[PDB]
C-alpha cells in the first residue's frame, strides 16, 4: 500500500465487567490516543482520572460537570446491568457442543512413533478442558495443545496432539469437558 | 471476571474512518455501518432478539472525530506508530476431501485499523462467498480482524491469505493447503 501520510487514532471504550452474574459490576471507561491510554473513569474510583499527562485536561473538564459524573456513577445500573440483561439469554446462556474427532496426523516424522490428533471444534463458550489417556491413565507428558482459538463467529476450536509410541492392544482416549455437556465426551483410537 | 461487554469506538485521520461496536467476551454482538446508517448484527438472530438505534452511534462518532483533532494538536501532532499484524490461517473444522469447509484468516495485534486482505487460490484472487469482520478491540488497544473463505477441499489447491499493512514492507502471504 502507498499513502505514508501520518495517521492519528482516537479510541473510546466502555467496559462492563460482571462477576457472579450481576452481583458485582464495574464500569471501566477508557480514552486512548494512538496507542496511549490517556484518561479513564473507573466505577470503583467514582471520578475521571488522567492516566498520562495528555488526559489531564479532559479529567478536569469532565469531573467539573456534575450531571456527567452522576450519570457515570449510576451507569453500572442504567448501562451495564441493563445491557447485560438485554442479551443474557443468547450470550451468557449460549451453549454449543464441541465436535470431537481423533485421527493420526497426516504427517508422521518418526518410524515407530504416531502423533495423534484430537480436534475439538465449533464450540461455545471458550471454557473447555481436553485430556489424553492411554489405557485409561491420563497422559501428562508429550501433549501439545494449539491453545484456544476464537473463530470470530461466536464459535471456538482447539487442537490437542499426543506424542505416542504405540503397542498393539493399547487404547488411546481423548476426553473433552465443556459446559455444553454433562458428562465428558470421549473418542478413542486403538493401536 | 465472569463476563465483559465492551462498547468500543474509534475515529482515524486522515482516512476519516470511524467505527462503533459492542462485543461480549471478545465476540462481536453488532457494529454500526456508518454509510448505510444501520446496525449490523454479527449473528442474524441477535437482531430478532434486541435492537440498537444506529443514529446514536453516529452522534458518538462525530464527538470522537472532534476529540481526535483536538488530541492531535494537543500532542504536538504526534502520529501513531504502525504495528504490523500477526497472521494465521486455519480451517474451522478438520478437512475431508470434497467436504465443504471454511478457511479463516486471523489478522491480529496491529494498528492503525487499516488493512488490505485478499484470498488467493493458486495465486488468483477469490471473492466468491467471502466475508469479514470489522476491527475488533484488544486489551492492549491494538486490533483484530477475521476474513472467511468457504471452499471445497482439494489435493490440488493452494491458498494464501494476502495481507498488506503500513507496518509491513511488503505483502504478507500466509498459505494453507490440504
Amino acid at each position: 500500500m502507498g499513502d505514508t501520510r501520518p495517521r492519528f487514532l482516537w479510541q473510546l471504550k466502555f467496559e462492563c465487567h460482571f462477576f457472579n452474574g450481576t452481583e458485582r459490576v464495574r464500569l471501566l471507561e477508557r480514552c486512548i490516543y494512538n496507542q496511549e491510554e490517556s484518561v479513564r473513569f473507573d466505577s470503583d474510583v467514582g471520578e475521571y482520572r488522567a492516566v498520562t499527562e495528555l488526559g489531564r485536561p479532559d479529567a478536569e473538564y469532565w469531573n467539573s460537570q456534575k450531571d456527567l459524573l452522576e450519570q457515570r456513577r449510576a451507569a453500572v445500573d442504567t448501562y451495564c446491568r441493563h445491557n447485560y440483561g438485554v442479551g443474557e439469554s443468547f450470550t451468557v446462556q449460549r451453549r454449543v457442543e464441541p465436535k470431537v474427532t481423533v485421527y493420526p496426523s497426516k504427517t508422521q516424522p518418526l518410524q515407530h512413533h504416531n502423533l495423534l490428533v484430537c480436534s475439538v471444534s465449533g464450540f461455545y463458550p471458550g471454557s473447555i478442558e481436553v485430556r489424553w489417556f492411554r489405557n485409561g491413565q491420563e497422559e501428562k507428558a508429550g501433549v501439545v495443545s494449539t491453545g484456544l482459538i476464537q473463530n470470530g463467529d461466536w464459535t471456538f476450536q482447539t487442537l490437542v496432539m499426543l506424542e505416542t509410541v504405540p503397542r498393539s492392544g493399547e487404547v488411546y482416549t481423548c476426553q473433552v469437558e465443556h459446559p455444553s455437556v454433562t458428562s465428558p465426551l470421549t473418542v478413542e483410537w486403538r493401536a | 471476571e465472569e463476563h465483559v461487554i465492551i462498547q468500543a469506538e474509534f475515529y482515524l485521520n486522515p482516512d476519516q474512518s470511524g467505527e462503533f461496536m459492542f462485543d461480549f467476551d471478545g465476540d462481536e454482538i453488532f457494529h454500526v455501518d456508518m454509510a448505510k446508517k444501520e446496525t449490523v448484527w454479527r449473528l442474524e438472530e441477535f437482531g430478532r432478539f434486541a435492537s440498537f438505534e444506529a443514529q446514536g452511534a453516529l452522534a458518538n462518532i462525530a464527538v470522537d472525530k472532534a476529540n481526535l483533532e483536538i488530541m492531535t494538536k494537543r500532542s504536538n501532532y504526534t502520529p501513531i506508530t504502525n504495528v504490523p499484524p500477526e497472521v494465521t490461517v486455519l480451517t474451522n473444522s478438520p478437512v475431508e476431501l470434497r467436504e465443504p469447509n471454511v478457511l479463516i484468516c486471523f489478522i491480529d495485534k496491529f494498528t492503525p485499523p487499516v488493512v488490505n486482505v485478499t484470498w488467493l487460490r493458486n495465486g488468483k484472487p477469490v471473492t466468491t462467498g467471502v466475508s469479514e469482520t470489522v476491527f475488533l478491540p484488544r486489551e492492549d488497544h491494538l486490533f483484530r480482524k477475521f476474513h472467511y473463505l468457504p471452499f471445497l477441499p482439494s489435493t490440488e489447491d493452494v491458498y494464501d491469505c494476502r495481507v498488506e499493512h503500513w507496518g509491513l514492507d511488503e505483502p504478507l502471504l500466509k498459505q494453507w493447503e490440504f
Binding site: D58, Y79 | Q7, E9, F49, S51, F52, N60, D64, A66
Partner: peptide, 15 residues
C-alpha cells in the same frame, strides 16, 4: 421494541 442495547455518550473534550 425488542430490548435495546443502550450506549454511553461520548463526552466532548476541552482544547
Amino acid at each position: 421494541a425488542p430490548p435495546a442495547y443502550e450506549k454511553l455518550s461520548a463526552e466532548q473534550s476541552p482544547p
